[PDB]
mmCIF file of C-alpha atoms in Angstrom:
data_model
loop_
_atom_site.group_PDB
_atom_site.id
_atom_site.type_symbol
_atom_site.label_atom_id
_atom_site.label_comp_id
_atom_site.label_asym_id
_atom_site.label_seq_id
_atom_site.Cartn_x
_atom_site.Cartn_y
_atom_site.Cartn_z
ATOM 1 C CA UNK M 8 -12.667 -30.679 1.667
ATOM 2 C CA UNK M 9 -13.308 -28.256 -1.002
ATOM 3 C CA UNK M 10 -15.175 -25.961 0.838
ATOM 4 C CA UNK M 11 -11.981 -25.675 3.298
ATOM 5 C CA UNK M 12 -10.133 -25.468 0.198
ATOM 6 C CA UNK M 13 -11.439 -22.625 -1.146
ATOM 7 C CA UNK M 14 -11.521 -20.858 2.733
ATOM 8 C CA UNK M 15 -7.801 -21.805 2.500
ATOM 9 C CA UNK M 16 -7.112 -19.988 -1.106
ATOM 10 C CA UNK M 17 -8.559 -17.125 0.209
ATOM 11 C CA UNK M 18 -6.427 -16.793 3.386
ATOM 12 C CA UNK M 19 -3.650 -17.395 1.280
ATOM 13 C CA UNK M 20 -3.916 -14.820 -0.773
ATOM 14 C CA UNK M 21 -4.883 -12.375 1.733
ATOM 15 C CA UNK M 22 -1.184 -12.825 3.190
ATOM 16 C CA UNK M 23 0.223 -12.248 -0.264
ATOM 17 C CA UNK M 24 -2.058 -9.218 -0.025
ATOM 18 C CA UNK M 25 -0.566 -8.022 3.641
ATOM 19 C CA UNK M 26 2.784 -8.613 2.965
ATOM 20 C CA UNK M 27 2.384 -5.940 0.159
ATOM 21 C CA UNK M 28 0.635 -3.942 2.429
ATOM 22 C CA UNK M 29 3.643 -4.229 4.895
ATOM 23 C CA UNK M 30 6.270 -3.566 2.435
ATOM 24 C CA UNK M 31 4.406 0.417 1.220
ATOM 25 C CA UNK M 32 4.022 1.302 5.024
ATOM 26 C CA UNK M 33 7.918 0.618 5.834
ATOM 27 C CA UNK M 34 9.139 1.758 2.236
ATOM 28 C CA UNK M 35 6.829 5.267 2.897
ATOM 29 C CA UNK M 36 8.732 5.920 5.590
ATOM 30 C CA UNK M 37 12.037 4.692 4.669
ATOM 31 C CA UNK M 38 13.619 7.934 3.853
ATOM 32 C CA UNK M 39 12.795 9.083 7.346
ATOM 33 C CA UNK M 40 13.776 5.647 8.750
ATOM 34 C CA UNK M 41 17.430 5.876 6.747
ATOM 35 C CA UNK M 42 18.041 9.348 7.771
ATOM 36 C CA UNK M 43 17.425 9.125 11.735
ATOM 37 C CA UNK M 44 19.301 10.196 14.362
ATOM 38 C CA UNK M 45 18.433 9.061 17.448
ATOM 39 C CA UNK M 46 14.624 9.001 16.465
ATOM 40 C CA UNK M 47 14.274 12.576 15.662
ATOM 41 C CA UNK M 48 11.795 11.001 12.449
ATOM 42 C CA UNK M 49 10.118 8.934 14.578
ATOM 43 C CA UNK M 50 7.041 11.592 15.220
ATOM 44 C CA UNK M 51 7.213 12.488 11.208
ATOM 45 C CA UNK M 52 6.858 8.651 10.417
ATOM 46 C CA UNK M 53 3.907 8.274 12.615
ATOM 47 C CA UNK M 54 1.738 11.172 10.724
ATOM 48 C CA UNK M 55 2.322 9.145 7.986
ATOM 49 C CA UNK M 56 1.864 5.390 8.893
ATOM 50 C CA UNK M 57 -1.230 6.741 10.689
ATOM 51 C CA UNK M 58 -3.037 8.427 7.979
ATOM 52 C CA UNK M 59 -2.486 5.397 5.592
ATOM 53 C CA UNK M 60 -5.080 3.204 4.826
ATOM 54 C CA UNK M 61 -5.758 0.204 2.115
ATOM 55 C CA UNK M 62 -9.663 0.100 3.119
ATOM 56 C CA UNK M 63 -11.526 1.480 6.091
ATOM 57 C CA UNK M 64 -10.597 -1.616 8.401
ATOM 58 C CA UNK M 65 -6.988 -1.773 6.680
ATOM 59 C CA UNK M 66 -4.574 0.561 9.020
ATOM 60 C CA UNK M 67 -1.249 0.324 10.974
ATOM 61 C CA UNK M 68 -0.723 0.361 14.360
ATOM 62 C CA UNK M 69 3.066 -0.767 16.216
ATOM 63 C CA UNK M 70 4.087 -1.736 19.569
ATOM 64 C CA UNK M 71 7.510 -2.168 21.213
ATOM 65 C CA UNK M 72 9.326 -5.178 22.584
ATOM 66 C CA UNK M 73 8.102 -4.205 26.007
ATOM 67 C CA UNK M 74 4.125 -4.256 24.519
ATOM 68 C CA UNK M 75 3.931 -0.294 24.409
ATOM 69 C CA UNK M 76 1.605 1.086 22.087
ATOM 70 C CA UNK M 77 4.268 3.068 19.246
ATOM 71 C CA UNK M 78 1.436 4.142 17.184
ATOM 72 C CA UNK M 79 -2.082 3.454 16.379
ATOM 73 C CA UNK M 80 -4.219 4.873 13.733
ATOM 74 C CA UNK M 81 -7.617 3.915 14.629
ATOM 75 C CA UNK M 82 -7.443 4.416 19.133
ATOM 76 C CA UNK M 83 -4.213 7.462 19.463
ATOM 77 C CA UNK M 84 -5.154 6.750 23.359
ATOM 78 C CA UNK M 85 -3.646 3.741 23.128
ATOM 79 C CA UNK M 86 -0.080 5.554 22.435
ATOM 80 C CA UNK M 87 2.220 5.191 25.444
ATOM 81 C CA UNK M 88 -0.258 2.046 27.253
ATOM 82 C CA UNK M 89 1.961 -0.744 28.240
ATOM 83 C CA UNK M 90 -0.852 -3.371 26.526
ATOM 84 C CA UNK M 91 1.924 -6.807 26.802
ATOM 85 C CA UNK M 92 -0.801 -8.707 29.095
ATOM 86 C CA UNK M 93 -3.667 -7.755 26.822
ATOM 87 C CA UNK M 94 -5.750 -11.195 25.660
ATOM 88 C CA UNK M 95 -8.201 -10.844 23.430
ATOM 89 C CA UNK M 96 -11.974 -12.494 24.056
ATOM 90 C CA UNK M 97 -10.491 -15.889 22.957
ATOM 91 C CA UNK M 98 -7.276 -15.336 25.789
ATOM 92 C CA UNK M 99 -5.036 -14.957 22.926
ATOM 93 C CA UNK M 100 -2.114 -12.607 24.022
ATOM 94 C CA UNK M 101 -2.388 -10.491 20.944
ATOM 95 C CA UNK M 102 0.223 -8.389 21.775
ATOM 96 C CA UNK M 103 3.274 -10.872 22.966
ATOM 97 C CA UNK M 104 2.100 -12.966 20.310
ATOM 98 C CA UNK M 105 3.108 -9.948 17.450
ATOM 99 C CA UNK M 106 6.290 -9.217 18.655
ATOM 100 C CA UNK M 107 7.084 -12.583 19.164
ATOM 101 C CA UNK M 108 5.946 -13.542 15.132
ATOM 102 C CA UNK M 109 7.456 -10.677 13.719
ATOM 103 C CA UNK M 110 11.360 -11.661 15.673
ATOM 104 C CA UNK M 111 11.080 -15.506 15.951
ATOM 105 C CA UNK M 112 8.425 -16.549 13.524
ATOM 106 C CA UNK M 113 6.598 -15.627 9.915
ATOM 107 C CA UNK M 114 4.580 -12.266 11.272
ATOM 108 C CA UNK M 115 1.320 -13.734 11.082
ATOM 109 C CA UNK M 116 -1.024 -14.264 14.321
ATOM 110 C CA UNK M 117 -4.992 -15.061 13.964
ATOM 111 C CA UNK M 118 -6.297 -12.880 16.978
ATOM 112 C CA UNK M 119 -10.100 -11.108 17.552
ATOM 113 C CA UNK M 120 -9.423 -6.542 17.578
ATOM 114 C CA UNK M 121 -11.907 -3.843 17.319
ATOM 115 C CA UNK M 122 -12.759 -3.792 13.466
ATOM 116 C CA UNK M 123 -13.449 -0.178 12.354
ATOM 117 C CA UNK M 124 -16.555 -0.428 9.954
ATOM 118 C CA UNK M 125 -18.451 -1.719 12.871
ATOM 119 C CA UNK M 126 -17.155 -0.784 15.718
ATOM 120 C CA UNK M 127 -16.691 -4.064 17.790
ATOM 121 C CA UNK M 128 -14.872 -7.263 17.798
ATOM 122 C CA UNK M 129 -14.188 -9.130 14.932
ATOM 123 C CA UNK M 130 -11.705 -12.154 13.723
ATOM 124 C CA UNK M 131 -8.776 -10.793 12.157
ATOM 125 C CA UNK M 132 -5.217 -11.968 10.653
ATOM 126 C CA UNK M 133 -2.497 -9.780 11.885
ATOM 127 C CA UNK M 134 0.798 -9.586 9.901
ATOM 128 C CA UNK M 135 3.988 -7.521 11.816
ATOM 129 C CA UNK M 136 7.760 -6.824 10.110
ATOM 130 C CA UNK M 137 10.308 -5.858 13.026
ATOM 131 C CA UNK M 138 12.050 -2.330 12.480
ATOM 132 C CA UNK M 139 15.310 -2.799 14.689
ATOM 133 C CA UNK M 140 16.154 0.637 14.805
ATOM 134 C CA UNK M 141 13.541 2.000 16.441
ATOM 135 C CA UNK M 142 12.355 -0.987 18.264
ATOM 136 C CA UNK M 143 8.852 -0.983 16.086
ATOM 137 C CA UNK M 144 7.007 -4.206 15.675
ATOM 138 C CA UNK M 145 4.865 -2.373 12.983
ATOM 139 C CA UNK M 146 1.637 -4.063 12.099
ATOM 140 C CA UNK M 147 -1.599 -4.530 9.982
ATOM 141 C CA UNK M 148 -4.116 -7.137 9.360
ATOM 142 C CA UNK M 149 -7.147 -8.057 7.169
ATOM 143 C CA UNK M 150 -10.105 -9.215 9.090
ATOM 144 C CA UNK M 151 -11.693 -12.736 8.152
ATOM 145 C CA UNK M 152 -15.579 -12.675 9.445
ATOM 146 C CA UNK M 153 -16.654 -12.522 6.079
ATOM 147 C CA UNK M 154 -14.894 -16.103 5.468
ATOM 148 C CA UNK M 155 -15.765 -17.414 9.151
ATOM 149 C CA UNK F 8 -13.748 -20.367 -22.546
ATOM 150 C CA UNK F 9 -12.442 -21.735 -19.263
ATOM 151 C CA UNK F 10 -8.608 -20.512 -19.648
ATOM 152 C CA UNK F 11 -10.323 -17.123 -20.436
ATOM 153 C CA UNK F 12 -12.311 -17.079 -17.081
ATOM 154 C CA UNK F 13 -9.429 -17.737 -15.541
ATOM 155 C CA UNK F 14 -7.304 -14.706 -17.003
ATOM 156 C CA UNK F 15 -10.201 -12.754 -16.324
ATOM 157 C CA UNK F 16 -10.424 -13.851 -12.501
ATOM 158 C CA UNK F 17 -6.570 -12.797 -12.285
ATOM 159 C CA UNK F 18 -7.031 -9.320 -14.283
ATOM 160 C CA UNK F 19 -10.295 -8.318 -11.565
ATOM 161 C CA UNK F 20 -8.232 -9.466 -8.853
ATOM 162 C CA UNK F 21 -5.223 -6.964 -9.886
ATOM 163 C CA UNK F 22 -7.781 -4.043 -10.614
ATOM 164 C CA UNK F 23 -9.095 -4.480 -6.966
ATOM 165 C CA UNK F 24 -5.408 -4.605 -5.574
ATOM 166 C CA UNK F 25 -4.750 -1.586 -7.621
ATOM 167 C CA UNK F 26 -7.420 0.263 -5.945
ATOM 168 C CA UNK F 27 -5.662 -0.532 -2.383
ATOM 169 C CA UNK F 28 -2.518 0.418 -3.837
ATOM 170 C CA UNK F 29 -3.800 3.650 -5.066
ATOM 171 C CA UNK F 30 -5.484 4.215 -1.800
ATOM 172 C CA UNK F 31 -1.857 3.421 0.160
ATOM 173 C CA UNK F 32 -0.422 6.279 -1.503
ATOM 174 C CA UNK F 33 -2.930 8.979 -1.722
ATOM 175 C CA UNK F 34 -3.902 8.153 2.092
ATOM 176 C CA UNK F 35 0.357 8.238 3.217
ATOM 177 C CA UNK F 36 0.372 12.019 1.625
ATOM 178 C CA UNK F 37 -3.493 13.210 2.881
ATOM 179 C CA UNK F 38 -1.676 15.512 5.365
ATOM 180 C CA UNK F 39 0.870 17.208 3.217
ATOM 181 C CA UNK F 40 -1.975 17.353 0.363
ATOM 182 C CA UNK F 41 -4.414 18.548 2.962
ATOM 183 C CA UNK F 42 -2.282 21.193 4.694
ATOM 184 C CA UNK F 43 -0.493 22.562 1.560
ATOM 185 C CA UNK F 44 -0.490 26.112 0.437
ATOM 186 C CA UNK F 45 -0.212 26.470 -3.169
ATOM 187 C CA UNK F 46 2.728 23.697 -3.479
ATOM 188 C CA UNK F 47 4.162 24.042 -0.528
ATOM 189 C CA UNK F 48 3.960 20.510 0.500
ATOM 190 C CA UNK F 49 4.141 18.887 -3.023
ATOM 191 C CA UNK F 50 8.252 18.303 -2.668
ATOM 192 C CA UNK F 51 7.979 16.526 0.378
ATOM 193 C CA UNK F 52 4.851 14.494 -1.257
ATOM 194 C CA UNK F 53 6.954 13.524 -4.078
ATOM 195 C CA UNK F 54 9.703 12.238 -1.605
ATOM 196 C CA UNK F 55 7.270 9.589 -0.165
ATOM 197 C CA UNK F 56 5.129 8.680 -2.820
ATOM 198 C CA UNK F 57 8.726 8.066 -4.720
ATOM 199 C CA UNK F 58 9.507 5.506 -2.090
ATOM 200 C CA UNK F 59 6.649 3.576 -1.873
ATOM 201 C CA UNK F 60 7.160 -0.062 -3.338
ATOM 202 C CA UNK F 61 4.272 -3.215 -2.917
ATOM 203 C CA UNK F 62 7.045 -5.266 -5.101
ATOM 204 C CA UNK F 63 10.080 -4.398 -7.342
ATOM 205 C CA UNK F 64 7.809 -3.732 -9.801
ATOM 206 C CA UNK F 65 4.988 -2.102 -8.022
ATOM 207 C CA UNK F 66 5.946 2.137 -7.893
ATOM 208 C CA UNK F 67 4.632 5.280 -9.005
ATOM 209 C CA UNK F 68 4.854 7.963 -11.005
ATOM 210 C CA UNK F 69 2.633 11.435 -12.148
ATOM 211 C CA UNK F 70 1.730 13.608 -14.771
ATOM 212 C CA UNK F 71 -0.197 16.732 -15.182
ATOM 213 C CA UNK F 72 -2.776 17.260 -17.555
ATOM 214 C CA UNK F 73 -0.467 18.973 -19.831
ATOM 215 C CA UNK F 74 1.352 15.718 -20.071
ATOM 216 C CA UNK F 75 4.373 17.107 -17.566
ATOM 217 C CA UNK F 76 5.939 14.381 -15.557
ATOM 218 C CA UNK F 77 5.816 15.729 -12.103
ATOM 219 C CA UNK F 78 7.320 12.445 -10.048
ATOM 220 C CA UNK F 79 8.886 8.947 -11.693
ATOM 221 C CA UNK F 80 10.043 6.657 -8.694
ATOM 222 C CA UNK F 81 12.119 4.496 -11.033
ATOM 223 C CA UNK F 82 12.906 6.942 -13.560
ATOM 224 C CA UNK F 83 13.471 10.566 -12.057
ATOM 225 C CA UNK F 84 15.538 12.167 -15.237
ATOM 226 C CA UNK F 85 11.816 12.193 -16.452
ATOM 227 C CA UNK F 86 10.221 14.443 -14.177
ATOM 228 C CA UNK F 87 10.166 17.899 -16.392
ATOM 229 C CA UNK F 88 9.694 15.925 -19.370
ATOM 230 C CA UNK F 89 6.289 16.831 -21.550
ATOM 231 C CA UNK F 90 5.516 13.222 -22.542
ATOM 232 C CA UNK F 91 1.720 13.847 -23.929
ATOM 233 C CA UNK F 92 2.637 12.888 -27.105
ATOM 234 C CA UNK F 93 4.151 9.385 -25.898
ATOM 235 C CA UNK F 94 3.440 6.000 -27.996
ATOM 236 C CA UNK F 95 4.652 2.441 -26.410
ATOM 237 C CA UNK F 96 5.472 -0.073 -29.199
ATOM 238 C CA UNK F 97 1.975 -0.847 -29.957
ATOM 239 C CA UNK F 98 0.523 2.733 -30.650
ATOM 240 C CA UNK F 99 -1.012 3.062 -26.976
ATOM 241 C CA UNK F 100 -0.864 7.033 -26.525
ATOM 242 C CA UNK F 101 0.140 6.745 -22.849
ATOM 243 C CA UNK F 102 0.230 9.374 -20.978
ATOM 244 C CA UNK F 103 -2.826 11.058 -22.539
ATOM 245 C CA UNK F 104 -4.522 7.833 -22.273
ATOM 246 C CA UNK F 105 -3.818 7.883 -18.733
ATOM 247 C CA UNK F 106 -4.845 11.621 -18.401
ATOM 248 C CA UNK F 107 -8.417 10.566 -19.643
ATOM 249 C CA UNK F 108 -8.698 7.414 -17.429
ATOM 250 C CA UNK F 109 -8.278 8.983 -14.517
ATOM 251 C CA UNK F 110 -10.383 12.402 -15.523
ATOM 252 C CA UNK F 111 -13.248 11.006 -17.693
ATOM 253 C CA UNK F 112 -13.319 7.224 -17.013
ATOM 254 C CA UNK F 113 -12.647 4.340 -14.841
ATOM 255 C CA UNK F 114 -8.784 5.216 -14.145
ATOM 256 C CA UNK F 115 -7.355 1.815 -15.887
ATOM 257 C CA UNK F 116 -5.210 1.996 -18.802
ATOM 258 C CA UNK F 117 -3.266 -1.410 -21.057
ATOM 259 C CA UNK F 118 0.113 -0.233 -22.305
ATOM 260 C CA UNK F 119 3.378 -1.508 -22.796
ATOM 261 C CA UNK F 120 5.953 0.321 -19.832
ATOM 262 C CA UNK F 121 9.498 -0.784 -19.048
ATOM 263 C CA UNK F 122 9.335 -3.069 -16.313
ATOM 264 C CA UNK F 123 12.157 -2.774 -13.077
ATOM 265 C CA UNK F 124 13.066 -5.637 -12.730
ATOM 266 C CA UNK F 125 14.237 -7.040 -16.555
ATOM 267 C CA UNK F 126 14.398 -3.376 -17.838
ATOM 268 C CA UNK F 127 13.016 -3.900 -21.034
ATOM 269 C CA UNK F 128 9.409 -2.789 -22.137
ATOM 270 C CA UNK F 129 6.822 -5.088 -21.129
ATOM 271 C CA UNK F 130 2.693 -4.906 -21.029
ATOM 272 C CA UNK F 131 1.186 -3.274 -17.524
ATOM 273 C CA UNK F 132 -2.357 -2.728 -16.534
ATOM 274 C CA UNK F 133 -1.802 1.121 -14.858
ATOM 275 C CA UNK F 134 -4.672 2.466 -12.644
ATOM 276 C CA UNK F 135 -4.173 6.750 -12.258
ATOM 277 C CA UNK F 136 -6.691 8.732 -10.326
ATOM 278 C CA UNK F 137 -6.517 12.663 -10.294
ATOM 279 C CA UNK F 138 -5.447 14.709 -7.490
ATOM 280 C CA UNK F 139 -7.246 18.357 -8.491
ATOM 281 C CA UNK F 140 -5.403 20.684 -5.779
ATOM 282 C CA UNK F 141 -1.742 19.681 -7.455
ATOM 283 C CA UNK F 142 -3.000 18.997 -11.195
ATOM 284 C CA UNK F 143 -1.374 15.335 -10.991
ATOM 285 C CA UNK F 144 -2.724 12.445 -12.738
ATOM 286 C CA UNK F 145 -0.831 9.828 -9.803
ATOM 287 C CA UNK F 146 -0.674 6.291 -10.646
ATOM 288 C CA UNK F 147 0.489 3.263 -10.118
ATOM 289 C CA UNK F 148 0.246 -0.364 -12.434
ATOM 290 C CA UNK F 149 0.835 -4.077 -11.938
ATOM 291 C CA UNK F 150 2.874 -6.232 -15.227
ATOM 292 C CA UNK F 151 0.737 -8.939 -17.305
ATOM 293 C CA UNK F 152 3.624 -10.536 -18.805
ATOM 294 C CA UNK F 153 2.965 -13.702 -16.603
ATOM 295 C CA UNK F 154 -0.686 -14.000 -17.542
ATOM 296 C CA UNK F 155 0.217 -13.071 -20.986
#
């Protein structure tokens, strides 16, 4: 019991943690975001959300409704791929199951991605905010292996 | 001794989300900072890094190492303003202080800073860290006025 406890504080605050992550990606591009018109910022929001970083596995990447890649600072070839289908090695539908937390439910999703520092699969906690305007589920995540 | 750990658990916590923080908003300018020629980019810098929120009270602001502000994000009418000489209500020489951090030592600095969202002055941990190309001391802080 304590033991999950403590696993359970930790997650916890990690979401605090993303949730501030969240908010200084879309407020670093809300000038751009405000002043659209008909997503001529678009391109000039995703040099930015791209570059940004909180640690070398801590990035943003966005997808959207239809599960097209929007942006993605660690795999650019991913821009434009229709990835809706995609399961991870678990069969979670990592994709569906973003858009579908950011609209309907609290943005979080628990889902296995390529973790940058060593290059393979690893256990991760997504968090996604919804950006209406240009149809951007807009994401990040903190990866848990170090926990589990 | 065991409400002291405790403040001391929260106080490391906020210095390592500090460093994210800090990391956020040098990382969201990298390509203006990387591609500018002599100032060129620093407007559009200032427009983003202005912004940038991780909560009402989370922002930041820059000096040069004459003491110039060169951005505020909650207080603009600043920027211009040589505040080297600045004392908060305890003494705390602020801005120098902060000039030093971030040059010769670990980038953290106590003072007392109005805080958003009761405007009033209040005591803030800031964390700067130096940006040579532009001369700005950038930084950011989190409020102890819970903890305290």
């Amino acid at each position: 019991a304590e033991l999950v406890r403590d696993r359970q504080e930790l997650i916890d605050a990690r979401k605090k943690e993303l949730k501030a992550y969240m908010m200084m990606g879309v407020t670093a591009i809300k000038p751009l975001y405000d002043s659209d018109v008909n997503g001529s910022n678009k391109q000039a929001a995703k040099e930015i959300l791209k570059a940004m970083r909180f640690e070398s596995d801590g990035y943003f990447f966005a997808y959207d409704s239809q599960g097209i890649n929007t942006l993605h600072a660690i795999k650019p070839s991913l821009e434009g791929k229709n990835l809706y289908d995609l399961k991870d090695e678990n069969g979670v539908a990592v994709i569906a199951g973003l858009i579908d937390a950011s609209q309907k439910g609290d943005g979080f999703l628990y889902f296995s991605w390529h973790k940058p520092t060593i290059n393979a699969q690893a256990p991760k906690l997504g968090y996604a905010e919804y950006l209406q305007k240009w149809d951007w589920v807009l994401g990040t995540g903190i990866y848990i292996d170090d926990i589990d």
